[PDB]
Amino acid sequence: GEFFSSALTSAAAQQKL
Amino acid sequence: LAAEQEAQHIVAAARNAKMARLRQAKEEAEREIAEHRAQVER
Amino acid sequence: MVRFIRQEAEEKANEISVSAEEEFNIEKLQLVEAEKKKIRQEYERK
């Protein structure tokens, strides 16, 4: 839950998944 | 993400497109049979 | 990259839709050929 925002940011930056 | 969002739209619209295209194709297909029947009736 | 693979999967779904449309068009042609056949048979009987 804490890292959900960071994961969303990382998915937006890096990038049926 | 972009990958997660983009794939959903085309996948969702695929079934509707297939159904609409099938219905339309049947629509002009029945026209040929109706025309043949009309020629036979004449 | 990942968006490319997602678009590839979406295009695969769309291609399945298009193949279904083409198969349905062929099936409609066969069905109306059968309709012409039954119409010709019934008209010959009449």
Cβ neighbours of A8 in B, within 8 Å: 1
Q: Which residues contact B20 (CB under 8 A, 6 or more apart)?
A: none
The CB density around residue C12, as the number of other CB atoms within 10 Å, is 15
Give CA–CA dist B2/A14, Å, rounded. Answer: 10
What lies within 8 Å, CB to CB, of B33 at 6+ separation is C32, C33, C35, C36, C39
Would the CB atoms of C1 and A15 count as touching at under 8 Å? yes
Query: At how many Å resolution was this determined?
Result: 4.3
Return the percent helix, strand and coil in chain C, to nearest 5: 95, 0, 5
| DSSP secondary structure string for all residues of C4-25 | HHHHHHHHHHHHHHHHHHHHHH
- The experimental method behind these coordinates is cryo-EM
Structural contact between residues B17 and C19, judged by C-beta atoms closer than 8 angstroms: no
| B38, C39 contact by CB (below 8 A) | no
Min Cα distance C39 → chain A (Å) is: 48
